[PDB]
Design a binder for this molecule. Structure first.
Ligand code: 4EL
Ligand code: 4EL
Ligand code: 4EL
Length: 1205
C-alpha cells in the first residue's frame, strides 16, 4: 500500500506530518497516525479494528469515504558541505558583530551620561561665571576675568572632544549595524537551501587595559571650575578628595566651595552607570571609570544602601539602578514581594544563634542514607573504622594526634567522647567525673575535616558524612581536627538584614460568547534579500502542544510588511486554558517545493500575571532564531518582548470587550466542574493502569489510552505516579475537562520528588499542576537531592510564565537557608546573565538573593573578580595570541600573571567548584597553558589550611574558554547517579565525576584529577613495537610498575570495573568519540574519561559505540595473556557490563526526565525531544529485557568485530 511505511521511527513520522493539513495520515507497525487540530493523533489497530468488536486496507478506505474528518491526504554531498561551511562562517561573523554592537551601544550610553554631566558643568559655570564677571568687570579686575575665562576655555574644549568622540562612535555603530543586516540577509537566503540540500542527502578605563602609574583626572567642582589633578592609580577616593580641595584653592571662585566632608564623587562607568561613590576606601583603578573624570556633588539618599547596591551590582554583573527604571509592574511587584522570602529565610537561620547561623554557612555535607551497601560494610572490619583526631597546641602550630577505633555509625559527639576516654584513661576519674569531662568537650568543641572547611555540626552518623564515606570507599585514614565552637562562631560575622528602599468592574473569561481572533497589523522591517514573499505565522500553544491548527496571514512582498488582517483561530474564549501562550514568527517563502524559513520569532502569555486576558494594541520586538532550529515556530522560547528595540517590531491588536476580562476564580471552576460531571474497575483495568504508569515519559500514548485514562481518572488517585500520563490525556482546549482536572489535582496524593520534577518541565505549563509539583518538593525534597538536581530546577525557572511563582520562592528560601545550595544557586544564575532572554528574570532573582545572603556576598564578589581576570586573559589569547606559537604564549602568560593587581585578585579566595576549598597563593611554576588545541589554562594554588598536608597541599583547576560546559555538567551528573544506582545494587564500579562548573558564556572550571595520565601520555612513557607504532603492552606494563606485590590484582580489578562503568555509560549517553587523549588512568588503575562536551545524536548531521576497547585495554583486563577474548577475566568483564546496562534500563525514567528539564537552555546538542529519543534507543525501552540485553551485545560486537556472544 502507498501509505504503509513499515517500520519507521516516531521522529520520522512527526517530520512528515509537520505543518500539514488536517486529514493527513500514514500507517506503520498496527498504528494509524492522523493529523487533527494541529497535533498528530495516534490510533492503534489490533490484529483488524480500532476497538472491539473488530470488523488492513479494508478499514482505511472506509474512513476515507471527537475526530471529525480525516483520511484525505495519504503520505550532491559536496554541495551540502560547501553550503554548510559557508553558513558556519557567517554565523561566526554574525555573533561577533552582534556582540561588538552591544558594546558600542553601551559605550554610547556612557558617552551620553558623560556629556550630560559636562553639560551640567557648563550650566553651573555659566551661572556663577555670569555674576562674578560682571562684578569683576565693574571693578576693572581683569585678572580674575581672565582666570575664569581661562578655565571655561578648557571646559568648553574638553566637552567638544567628548561630543566629537560620541559622534564618531555613532557613525561606526551605524556602519556596523548595516553590516549586521547584510549578514542576516545572507544567512536567511542560505537557510532554506541548506535544509533542502541536506534533506536530499539523507534521502540517498574604557579601551585601556590598565591605568598608567600616574594618571590625570579632571575633577568637576560645584562652583563650575574644572581642575586637573595628578593621581596615583592606587589612591583611594579619600586621598583624592583631600588633595583635590588643596588644589582647588589655586583656582577661581574657591570661596563657594563647602568643606570636603559635604561632598562625594560621582562619575560614569564602563557599564554606562552614573555612580555615586559613597565608599571612599575604594581605589581609583578599581572604579572601572568610563573616562578619567570625577564630579563633586552633595550626597543624596541612604549611604549604606548605595554602598550595598554597588556590591550587589558587581556580583550580578548588572547595575541595580537598571531595575529601578523598568516600568513593568510585574517587575516592580516581584522586587517588592520577593522580600517576604528574604525575611523568612533570615529569620529562620537566626532562630537559634549562633548555631543555626553556623548550620547555614557550613551545612553538613552528607550522603542520602545512613544505610551502607553490603560490600561497603565489609570494607571496614567488624563495623569499626579507625579515625585520627588532631589538636593544635601553642601558637607554633604544633599538632598532637589521637588515634581512635569507633563504630562507623556513631555520631560526632560520641567520637569526641572517645577522644576524652582515651586521654583520661590514666587520670582515674570516677564515673561522674568522666561524664562531666565529656559533657564539657561536647559542648565546647566540634569536629573539622583536616585540609578544608568542612564540619560535622549535626547528629548524622559519622559514616554518612561525604568525607568519611569517601575514606571508607578509598581505604584512606579519616583525619579530623578538634576545634572550639567559639573559634567557629567568631569566624561567622553576625549580620543583620535591612529592607531596601523599594519595599515601600472587569468581567469573566467564561462569560464571553465568541471565538479567539487576533489582528496582525504590520512589522517595522525584516532582513531579507528581494526570497519572494513573507508572512506572519501564528499559533496558540499550551506547553509545546498546539491547541488548534496554526493560522497564517496572507503573503506579502518583502519590501512592504503590512497585513492588517484578522486571524481566526478555532477555539472558544471560555475554552482557553490559563497557561495558553501565543507563539508567532515572521517567515519567508523561496520560490521548487516552496522552502520555508523562520526570519524571526516571539511569544506572549495570553493572560498576564494578574490573570488579565490581553487586550488592545501591542508592539512586540522579536528575537533571532536559535542556531539549529528549523521549525517555523518556537514554543519552547521565552515569552515577552526583546529588550533590544533595534530589531524587527511586530504590532498586534487584540479583541476588545466591554471591560477587563479576567480568568475565573476557583469557586466558579469547581462549580463548573460539578456541572460537567452531572451532564456526563476490573482486574485488566488495574493492570493496564499499572502498565501505563511504568513506561517512560517519551513513550507513545494512543488515543484509546487517553480515553481509557480519562474515563478512569477518578481511580488514578490510587496510582498517584500515573498523574503525568493522565495530564497528557486531558483535552486542554476544553474547559469542561480542565475544570475537572483541577478538582483532582488539588486533592491529588503526593509523589516522589524525582517523579514530581517531571511536572516542572516544558510540557506542564499549568499553574495548578506546577503548584502541586512544588508542594511535593517542599515536603519530600531533601537538601541533598535539591543539591543534586539544582541545575535542572534552575533551568525550569525559564518555563515559568511569571516572575513571581511558587518554584522561585521555594528555591530562594532554600538558597538563603543553605549556603552550599546558595553558592551554586548564585553561579548557575550568574553564568546565564549574558543571555538576554533570561537576563531580566535571573538578574532580578540574583538581586533578591544577594540582599539576604549575608556576609557571603563579600566572598562571592571575590570569586567574580577572580573569574573576570581569567576570562579577560583567556579571551586575549583567543584573539591577539591566537596565532603565535605556544612558546610565546607562555611568555605572555607568566608576564600577565606576575602583575601585582592580578596576583592580589587570584590569591586568597574560595574555589567556585568547592567553596570548602580555600585557594591560597598561586604556585606559578605549575601554572601553564595546556598543549591541547583549545589551549585552556592549568592553574595551581596552595592550600592555606594549617592541616592541609593531611588532605592535599595543592589545588589544581583547568579554566577552559570557548566550549559550553553545561553539557559536561549534565554528563558528570548522570555519571554520578549511575554509580549510585550500581553501588546500591551491589555492583562496585568506580566512576570519576570530577567537578565541573560553568561560570559564564562558554567559560567554566574543571577539577583536576591528581595522579592520572592519558593513554597517550602512558604510551609515550613506553616504546615502539611495530613499525612507527606504540607497543600495545605499555599500558599494562605501566600498571605493573605502579602496582607491584599483592596489590597487582586490586589494580586490574579496579581497572576492569571502572572500564565496565564507562562502557555502559558512554554507550547509553552517546558521548563524543573516544580516543587516547580523552581516556585516562590513575596510578591505582582506575579508568575514567574527560571531554564530555558531546552527547546523544550529535553526529546526526554528517548509532555508535563511542568507547571501543583496543588491544591495550583488553591486555589489562585479561592480565597480559594472548587471545584476551577467551579468558575468564574478560567474561567476568562482560557480565559487569550486562548487569550495569540492565540496572540503568530499570531507572531509565529518571534520566529521560533529567534531559527533558534541560531543553530550555541553549545547549547545541539538546534541542528538541527527538534528541532525547537517542537514550530510548540505546536503552531499548520499547523492547523487553531479554531483547534489550541482546541489543547491547550486538552493538558491542559490531564495534569490536566479534568477541561478544
Ligand atoms: C456552564 O457554562 C456556563 C458558562 C457561562 C455562564 C454564564 C454566562 C453569563 C453571560 N454570558 C452569556 C453569553 C451567552 C449566552 S447564550 O444563551 O445566549 N448562548 C449560549 N448558550 N449556551 C452555550 C454553550 S452558548 C448566555 C450567557 C452569565 C453568567 C452568570 O451570571 O453567572 C453565567 C453559565 N454557564
Ligand atoms: C460561553 O457562554 C456560555 C457557555 C455555556 C453556557 C451554558 C449555560 C447553561 C445554563 N445553566 C447553567 C449551568 C451550569 C452553571 S455553573 O455555575 O455550575 N458553571 C458556571 N458558572 N458560571 C460560569 C461562567 S460557568 C450555571 C448555569 C448550561 C450549559 C450547558 O450545560 O451546556 C451551558 C452559557 N453561556
Ligand atoms: C580532569 O582531570 C584531568 C583532565 C585532563 C588532564 C590532562 C589532559 C591532557 C591531554 N588531554 C586533553 C583532552 C582534552 C582537553 S580540553 O581542553 O579540550 N577539554 C577538557 N580538558 N580537561 C577536562 C577534564 S575536559 C585538554 C587535554 C594533558 C594534560 C597535561 O598537560 O598534563 C592533562 C589531566 N587531568
Amino acid at each position: 500500500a502507498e501509505w504503509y511505511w513499515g517500520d519507521i521511527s516516531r521522529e520520522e513520522v512527526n517530520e512528515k506530518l509537520r505543518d500539514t493539513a488536517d486529514g493527513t495520515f500514514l500507517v506503520r507497525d498496527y498504528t494509524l497516525t492522523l493529523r487533527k487540530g494541529g497535533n498528530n493523533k495516534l490510533i492503534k489497530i489490533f490484529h483488524y479494528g480500532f476497538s472491539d468488536p473488530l470488523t488492513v486496507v479494508e478499514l482505511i478506505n472506509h474512513y476515507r469515504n471527537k475526530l471529525d474528518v480525516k483520511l484525505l491526504y495519504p503520505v550532491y554531498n559536496t554541495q551540502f558541505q560547501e553550503k554548510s561551511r559557508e553558513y558556519d562562517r557567517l554565523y561566526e561573523e554574525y555573533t561577533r558583530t552582534s556582540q561588538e554592537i552591544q558594546m558600542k551601544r553601551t559605550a554610547i550610553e556612557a558617552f551620553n551620561e558623560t556629556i550630560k554631566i559636562f553639560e551640567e558643568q557648563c550650566q553651573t559655570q555659566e551661572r556663577y561665571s555670569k555674576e562674578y564677571i560682571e562684578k569683576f568687570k565693574r571693578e576693572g579686575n581683569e585678572k580674575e576675568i581672565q582666570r575664569i575665562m581661562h578655565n571655561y576655555d578648557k571646559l568648553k574644549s574638553r566637552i567638544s572632544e567628548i561630543i566629537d568622540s560620541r559622534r564618531r562612535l555613532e557613525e561606526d555603530l551605524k556602519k556596523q549595524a548595516a553590516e549586521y543586516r547584510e549578514i542576516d540577509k545572507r544567512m536567511n537566503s542560505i537557510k532554506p537551501d541548506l535544509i533542502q540540500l541536506r534533506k536530499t542527502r539523507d534521502q540517498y578605563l574604557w579601551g585601556i587595559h590598565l591605568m598608567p602609574p600616574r594618571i590625570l583626572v579632571e575633577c568637576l567642582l560645584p562652583n563650575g571650575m574644572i581642575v586637573t589633578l595628578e593621581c596615583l592609580r592606587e589612591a583611594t577616593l579619600i586621598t583624592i578628595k583631600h588633595e583635590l580641595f588643596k588644589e582647588a584653592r589655586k583656582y577661581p571662585l574657591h570661596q563657594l566651595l563647602q568643606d570636603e566632608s559635604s561632598y562625594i564623587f560621582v562619575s560614569v562607568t564602563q557599564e554606562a552607570e552614573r555612580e555615586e561613590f559613597f565608599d571612599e576606601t575604594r581605589r581609583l583603578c578599581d572604579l572601572r571609570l568610563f573616562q578619567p573624570f570625577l564630579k563633586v556633588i552633595e550626597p543624596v539618599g541612604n549611604r549604606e544602601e548605595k554602598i550595598l547596591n554597588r556590591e550587589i551590582g558587581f556580583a550580578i554583573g548588572m547595575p541595580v539602578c537598571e531595575f529601578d527604571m523598568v516600568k513593568d509592574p510585574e517587575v516592580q511587584d516581584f522586587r517588592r514581594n520577593i522580600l517576604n522570602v528574604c525575611k523568612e529565610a533570615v529569620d529562620l537561620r537566626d532562630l537559634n544563634s549562633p548555631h543555626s547561623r553556623a548550620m547555614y554557612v557550613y551545612p553538613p555535607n552528607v550522603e542520602s542514607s545512613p544505610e551502607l551497601p553490603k560490600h561497603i560494610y565489609n570494607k571496614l572490619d567488624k563495623g569499626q573504622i579507625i579515625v585520627v583526631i588532631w589538636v593544635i597546641v601553642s601558637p607554633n602550630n604544633d599538632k598532637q594526634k589521637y588515634t581512635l577505633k569507633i563504630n562507623h555509625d556513631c555520631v560526632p559527639e560520641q567520637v569526641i567522647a572517645e577522644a576524652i576516654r582515651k586521654k583520661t584513661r590514666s587520670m582515674l576519674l570516677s564515673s561522674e567525673q568522666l561524664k562531666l569531662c565529656v559533657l564539657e568537650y561536647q559542648g565546647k568543641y566540634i569536629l573539622k575535616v583536616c585540609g578544608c572547611d568542612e564540619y560535622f555540626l549535626e547528629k548524622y552518623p559519622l559514616s554518612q558524612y561525604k568525607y568519611i564515606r569517601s575514606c571508607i570507599m578509598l581505604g584512606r585514614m579519616p583525619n579530623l581536627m578538634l576545634m572550639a565552637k567559639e573559634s567557629l562562631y567568631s569566624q561567622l560575622p553576625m549580620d543583620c538584614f535591612t529592607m531596601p528602599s523599594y519595599s515601600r468592574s472587569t468581567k469573566s473569561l467564561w462569560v464571553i460568547n465568541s471565538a479567539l481572533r487576533i489582528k496582525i497589523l504590520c512589522a517595522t522591517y525584516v532582513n531579507v534579500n528581494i526570497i519572494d514573499k513573507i508572512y506572519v505565522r501564528t499559533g496558540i500553544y499550551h506547553g509545546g502542544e498546539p491547541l488548534c491548527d496554526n493560522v497564517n496571514t496572507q503573503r506579502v512582498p518583502c519590501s512592504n510588511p503590512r497585513w492588517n488582517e484578522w486571524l481566526n483561530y478555532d477555539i472558544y474564549i471560555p475554552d482557553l486554558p490559563r497557561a495558553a501562550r501565543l507563539c508567532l514568527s515572521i517567515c519567508s517563502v523561496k520560490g521548487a517545493k516552496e522552502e520555508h524559513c523562520p526570519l524571526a520569532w516571539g511569544n506572549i502569555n495570553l493572560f498576564d500575571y494578574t490573570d488579565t486576558l490581553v487586550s488592545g494594541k501591542m508592539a512586540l520586538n522579536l528575537w533571532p532564531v536559535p542556531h539549529g532550529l528549523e521549525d517555523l515556530l518556537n514554543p519552547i522560547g521565552v515569552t515577552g518582548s526583546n529588550p533590544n528595540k533595534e530589531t524587527p517590531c511586530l504590532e498586534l491588536e487584540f479583541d476588545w470587550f466591554s471591560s477587563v476580562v479576567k480568568f475565573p476564580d476557583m469557586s466558579v471552576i469547581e462549580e463548573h466542574a460539578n456541572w460537567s460531571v452531572s451532564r456526563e474497575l476490573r482486574e485488566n483495568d488495574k493492570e493496564q493502569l499499572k502498565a501505563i504508569s511504568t513506561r517512560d515519559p517519551l513513550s507513545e500514548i494512543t488515543e484509546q489510552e487517553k480515553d481509557f485514562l480519562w474515563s478512569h481518572r477518578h481511580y488514578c488517585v490510587t496510582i498517584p505516579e500515573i498523574l503525568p500520563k493522565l495530564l497528557l490525556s486531558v483535552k486542554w482546549n476544553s474547559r469542561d475537562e480542565v475544570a475537572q482536572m483541577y478538582c483532582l489535582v488539588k486533592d491529588w496524593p503526593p509523589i516522589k520528588p524525582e517523579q514530581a520534577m517531571e511536572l516542572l518541565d516544558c510540557n506542564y505549563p499549568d499553574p495548578m499542576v506546577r503548584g502541586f509539583a512544588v508542594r511535593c518538593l517542599e515536603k519530600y525534597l531533601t537538601d541533598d537531592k535539591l543539591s543534586q538536581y539544582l541545575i535542572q530546577l534552575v533551568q525550569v525557572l525559564k518555563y515559568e510564565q511569571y516572575l513571581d511563582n511558587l518554584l522561585v520562592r521555594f528555591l530562594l528560601k532554600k538558597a538563603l537557608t543553605n549556603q552550599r545550595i546558595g553558592h551554586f544557586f548564585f553561579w548557575h544564575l550568574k553564568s546565564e546573565m549574558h543571555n538576554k532572554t533570561v537576563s531580566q528574570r535571573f538578574g532580578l532573582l540574583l538581586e533578591s538573593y544577594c540582599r539576604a545572603c549575608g556576609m557571603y556576598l563579600k566572598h562571592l564578589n571575590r570569586q567574580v573578580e577572580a573569574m573576570e581576570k581569567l576570562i579577560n586573559l583567556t579571551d586575549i589569547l583567543k584573539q591577539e595570541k591566537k596565532d603565535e606559537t605556544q612558546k610565546v604564549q607562555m611568555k605572555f602568560l607568566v608576564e600577565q600573571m606576575r602583575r601585582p593587581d592580578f596576583m592580589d585578585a587570584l590569591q586568597g579566595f574560595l574555589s567556585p567548584l568547592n567553596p570548602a576549598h580555600q585557594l591560597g597563593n598561586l604556585r606559578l611554576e605549575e601554572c601553564r597553558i595546556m598543549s591541547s588545541a583549545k589551549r585552556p589554562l592549568w592553574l595551581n594554588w596552595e592550600n592555606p589550611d594549617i592541616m592541609s598536608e593531611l588532605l592535599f597541599q595543592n589545588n589544581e583547576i583547568i579554566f577552559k574558554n570557548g566550549d559550553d560546559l553545561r553539557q559536561d555538567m549534565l554528563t558528570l551528573q548522570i555519571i554520578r547517579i549511575m554509580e549510585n544506582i550500581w553501588q546500591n545494587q551491589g555492583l562496585d564500579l568506580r566512576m570519576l565525576p570530577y567537578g565541573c562548573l560553568s561560570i559564564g558564556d562558554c567559560v567554566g572550571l574543571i577539577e583536576v584529577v591528581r595522579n592520572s595520565h592519558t593513554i597517550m601520555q602512558i604510551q609515550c612513557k613506553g616504546g615502539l613495537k611495530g613499525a612507527l607504532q606504540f607497543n600495545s603492552h605499555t599500558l599494562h606494563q605501566w600498571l605493573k610498575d605502579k602496582n607491584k606485590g599483592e596489590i597487582y590484582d586490586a589494580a586490574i580489578d579496579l581497572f576492569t570495573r571502572s572500564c565496565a562503568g564507562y562502557c555502559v555509560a558512554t554507550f547509553i549517553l552517546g558521548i563524543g568519540d573516544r580516543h587516547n587523549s580523552n581516556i585516562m588512568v590513575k596510578d591505582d588503575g582506575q579508568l575514567f574519561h574527560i571531554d564530555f562536551g558531546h552527547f546523544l545524536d550529535h553526529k546526526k548531521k554528517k548509532e555508535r559505540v563511542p568507547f571501543v576497547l583496543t588491544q591495550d585495554f583488553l591486555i589489562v583486563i585479561s592480565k597480559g595473556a594472548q587471545e584476551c577474548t577467551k579468558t575468564r577475566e574478560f567474561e567476568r568483564f562482560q557480565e559487569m557490563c550486562y548487569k550495569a546496562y540492565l540496572a540503568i534500563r530499570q531507572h531509565a525514567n529518571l534520566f529521560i526526565n533529567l534531559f527533558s528539564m534541560m531543553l530550555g537552555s541553549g545547549m547545541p546538542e539538546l534541542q528538541s525531544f527527538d534528541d532525547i529519543a537517542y537514550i530510548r534507543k540505546t536503552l531499548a525501552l520499547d523492547k523487553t529485557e531479554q531483547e534489550a540485553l541482546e541489543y547491547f551485545m550486538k552493538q558491542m560486537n559490531d564495534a569490536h568485530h566479534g568477541g561478544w556472544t
